[PDB]
């Protein structure tokens with residue numbers, strides 16, 4: 275009942291980019307994570323949880339029938355057909371095994387949701403690829419086919435009858451797919467901190483700015499924290515969690531926390547441009563264990579430096595397992611640019627959250 279679940283299957287390595295041997299979204303991402311968890315002795319301290327394939331009905335909580343059908347058909351396509359389809363999307367490749375792996379990727383999160391919601395485990399982490407947070411109702415995007423966490427959130431609500439789910443997205447990119455899916459939904463609060471640079475950084479969306487707060491019944495339930503300078507450090511992230519995310523999370527009172535656990539903000543990532551120490555993720559994970567009775571499930575999103583991502587996963591896992599948090603060399607003092615972004619997000623969200631008022 276107190277344990278930490280871990281899901282990993284070899285199927286997560288069984289797809290890769292057929293037309294770019296240097297593609298950064300590659301099978302080594304997950305095998306290096308598993309190898310470091312093993313050598314650090316963390317893997318043996320976790321409860322191994324089996325994966326499962328998502329069902330059509332589960333996919334349809336988020337995705338359209340037509341899109342599911344098209345994705346299913348990719349398993350029978352030629353390489354030329356896969357490339358022609360992949361090129362209709364932004365930042366996507368395809369592979370004959372992609373669909374099968376994507377179904378296990380979603381299902382791995384659902385397995386952990388089952389165990390955590392029924393108190394069989396305290397928390398858990400799926401070491402999954404493909405990632406999910408960019409995937410949309412009817413299209414692939416950003417190396418994602420299905421939106422793992424969006425499905426998991428609606429599954430927790432439908433199956434386990436959870437009323438409120440908090441999704442925390444600390445990947446360096448905006449999870450616009452999650453934002454879109456829950457745009458009008460007050461039962462799922464989406465928080466994303468991401469590099470933005472006034473739209474210069476991918477995916478270059480105006481909707482990634484803090485003015486996008488959700489709409490209709492969902493007004494106030496979408497919170498974007500855009501960084502407009504590179505080089506953010508641990509103290510910038512800790513400060514954002516302390517000033518903005520935690521006060522709102524406690525007011526929202528979620529019954530489950532899902533984390534889009536990308537590690538492309540870690541020092542050394544080839545694209546993220548940030549300078550967050552892997553150890554920072556021990557602290558960020560610890561800061562999220564205080565809501566939802568500690569019912570916390572992390573799922574791997576991005577992170578392209580094999581060592582940096584593995585270290586970030588290990589740091590998060592140490593906190594899931596209850597190990598005392600490391601001391602951070604860096605002082606938790608944020609930079610001026612981070613404070614500017616945090617204050618602006620608070621300004622945009624204050625009408626909706628009593629915890630964000632004076």
Ligand SMILES: CC(C)[C@H](C(=O)Nc1ccc(C(=O)NO)cc1)c1ccccc1
Nearest residue numbers: 365416417445447476536538575576577
């Ligand atoms: C051209 C560049 C802007 C583009 C890109 O970087 N996309 C991108 C999308 C999602 C993630 C992610 O999942 N991060 O966690 C990471 C990167 C790209 C496209 C094709 C091959 C390489 C790179």
Ligand SMILES: [K+]
Nearest residue numbers: 443445447467
């Ligand atoms: K993010």
Ligand SMILES: [K+]
Nearest residue numbers: 456459462495
């Ligand atoms: K929402």
Ligand SMILES: [Zn+2]
Nearest residue numbers: 445446447576
């Ligand atoms: Zn990313």
